[PDB]
Design an enzyme around this catalytic site. Structure first.
Site, mmCIF file in Angstrom:
data_model
loop_
_atom_site.group_PDB
_atom_site.id
_atom_site.type_symbol
_atom_site.label_atom_id
_atom_site.label_comp_id
_atom_site.label_asym_id
_atom_site.label_seq_id
_atom_site.Cartn_x
_atom_site.Cartn_y
_atom_site.Cartn_z
ATOM 1 N N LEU A 17 0.814 -1.211 0.000
ATOM 2 C CA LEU A 17 0.000 0.000 0.000
ATOM 3 C C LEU A 17 0.850 1.266 0.000
ATOM 4 O O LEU A 17 0.385 2.337 -0.386
ATOM 5 C CB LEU A 17 -0.947 -0.002 1.200
ATOM 6 N N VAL A 22 3.658 -0.517 4.477
ATOM 7 C CA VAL A 22 2.336 -0.974 4.882
ATOM 8 C C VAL A 22 1.788 -1.876 3.791
ATOM 9 O O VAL A 22 1.860 -1.541 2.604
ATOM 10 C CB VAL A 22 1.365 0.210 5.110
ATOM 11 N N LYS A 36 1.214 -2.805 9.117
ATOM 12 C CA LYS A 36 2.271 -1.802 9.167
ATOM 13 C C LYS A 36 3.521 -2.453 9.741
ATOM 14 O O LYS A 36 3.521 -2.904 10.885
ATOM 15 C CB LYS A 36 1.838 -0.608 10.026
ATOM 16 N N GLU A 81 -7.343 -2.402 11.188
ATOM 17 C CA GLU A 81 -8.421 -2.173 10.251
ATOM 18 C C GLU A 81 -7.865 -1.703 8.902
ATOM 19 O O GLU A 81 -6.952 -0.879 8.861
ATOM 20 C CB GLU A 81 -9.292 -1.082 10.870
ATOM 21 N N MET A 83 -8.188 0.353 5.494
ATOM 22 C CA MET A 83 -8.870 1.572 5.065
ATOM 23 C C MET A 83 -8.676 1.775 3.558
ATOM 24 O O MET A 83 -7.675 2.350 3.114
ATOM 25 C CB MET A 83 -8.350 2.769 5.868
ATOM 26 N N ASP A 127 0.293 14.171 16.983
ATOM 27 C CA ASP A 127 0.636 14.541 15.605
ATOM 28 C C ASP A 127 -0.577 14.480 14.671
ATOM 29 O O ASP A 127 -0.533 13.839 13.621
ATOM 30 C CB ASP A 127 1.807 13.693 15.075
ATOM 31 N N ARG A 131 -2.356 13.857 6.858
ATOM 32 C CA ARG A 131 -1.482 12.750 6.449
ATOM 33 C C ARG A 131 -1.598 11.548 7.383
ATOM 34 O O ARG A 131 -1.215 10.436 7.005
ATOM 35 C CB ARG A 131 -0.023 13.204 6.375
ATOM 36 N N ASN A 132 -2.122 11.799 8.587
ATOM 37 C CA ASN A 132 -2.308 10.796 9.646
ATOM 38 C C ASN A 132 -3.759 10.385 9.845
ATOM 39 O O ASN A 132 -4.103 9.832 10.895
ATOM 40 C CB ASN A 132 -1.749 11.314 10.985
ATOM 41 N N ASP A 145 -2.472 6.456 13.654
ATOM 42 C CA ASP A 145 -1.135 6.737 14.194
ATOM 43 C C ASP A 145 -1.166 7.488 15.525
ATOM 44 O O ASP A 145 -0.199 8.183 15.883
ATOM 45 C CB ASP A 145 -0.288 7.507 13.167
ATOM 46 N N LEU A 148 1.735 7.660 18.293
ATOM 47 C CA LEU A 148 2.883 6.894 17.790
ATOM 48 C C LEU A 148 4.188 7.686 17.751
ATOM 49 O O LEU A 148 5.270 7.096 17.855
ATOM 50 C CB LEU A 148 2.563 6.286 16.410
#
Ligand SMILES: Nc1ncnc2c1c(-c1ccc(Oc3ccccc3)cc1)cn2C1CCCC1
Length: 264
Positions: A17, A22, A36, A81, A83, A127, A131-132, A145, A148
């Protein structure tokens, strides 16, 4: 195997991905998962493993669900999960979607619900950014994330001087003093609303990180995306009060977002 531990032999890897890599795969031949894979030397592994136990007990429909970890071998796996529509940032930038503003507000609400839940558990994201966040096959946005960043060993990402630090999502008190709190998540959320209504534009697009930090220290702010109504802009802007104590809670933000949805 502990409750937080998945047997990697139960995994079937199907496609890449895109910290590491990932993959998409199946658990026990049937159930969609994302895997991941955490690169050697990238993570404070023992610390992450203990925290994984806390993260396993978090459960909300708008939070990416952590199924377990694989840590008896290396690289360690984080099993979650799946996505289907990937990273929110990329999704926003796909102009083909031709989003209505109702859809954008719903993305904001998805994230705000997850964050209200995290706040209720006294769990900081640390964070939050487009993007997260991830998007499922139904177009639902979920927060990912979470927490993390605490376990990343690359110092370039660890502090505000670092070259990989999320300066553009950081309130003055973080940039100046490294003061993290619920209210730094609140600030980041406002920037995320701005990313959503800007269809994935980089915050402070024309500035460097250095320039952005200066801008912020001078009390200057992002301004209204073309797609944001005055009411929506009011909500994101409320996340950027200079004084951290004057910023709303996620509960209050959620109520405000619901109100705008009702008023359209
Ligand atoms: N779960 C996913 N499903 C589909 N795509 C995903 C992911 C994930 C993903 C998977 C696991 C993961 O692990 C955590 C989830 C929640 C909390 C902590 C770790 C984080 C993101 C990433 N990607 C993509 C986005 C851009 C390129 C790769």
């Amino acid at each position: 195997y502990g409750s937080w531990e998945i047997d990697p032999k139960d995994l079937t890897f199907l496609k890449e991905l895109g910290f590491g890599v990932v993959k998409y795969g199946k658990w026990r031949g049937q159930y969609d998962v994302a895997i991941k894979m955490i690169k050697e030397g990238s993570m404070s592994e023992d610390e992450f493993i203990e925290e994984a136990k806390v993260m396993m007990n978090l459960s909300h429909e708008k939070l990416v669900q952590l199924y377990g970890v694989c840590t008896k071998q290396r690289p360690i796996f984080i099993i979650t999960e799946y996505m289907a529509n990937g990273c929110l940032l990329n999704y926003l930038r796909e102009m083909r979607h031709r989003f209505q503003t109702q859809q954008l507000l719903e993305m904001c609400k998805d994230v705000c619900e997850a964050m209200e839940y995290l706040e209720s558990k006294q769990f900081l994201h640390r964070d939050l950014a487009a993007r997260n966040c991830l998007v499922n096959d139904q177009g639902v946005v979920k927060v990912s994330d979470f927490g993390l960043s605490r376990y990343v060993l690359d110092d370039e990402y660890t502090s505000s001087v670092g070259s990989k630090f999320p300066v553009r999502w950081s309130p003055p008190e973080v940039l100046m003093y490294s003061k993290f709190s619920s209210k730094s998540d609140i600030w980041a959320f406002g920037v995320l609303m701005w990313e959503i209504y800007s269809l994935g534009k980089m915050p402070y697009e024309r500035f460097t990180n250095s320039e952005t930090a200066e801008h912020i220290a001078q009390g200057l702010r992002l301004y209204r995306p073309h797609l944001a109504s005055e009411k929506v802009y009011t909500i994101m802007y409320s996340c950027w009060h200079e004084k951290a104590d004057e910023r709303p809670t996620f509960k209050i933000l959620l109520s405000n977002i619901l109100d705008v949805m009702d008023e359209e």
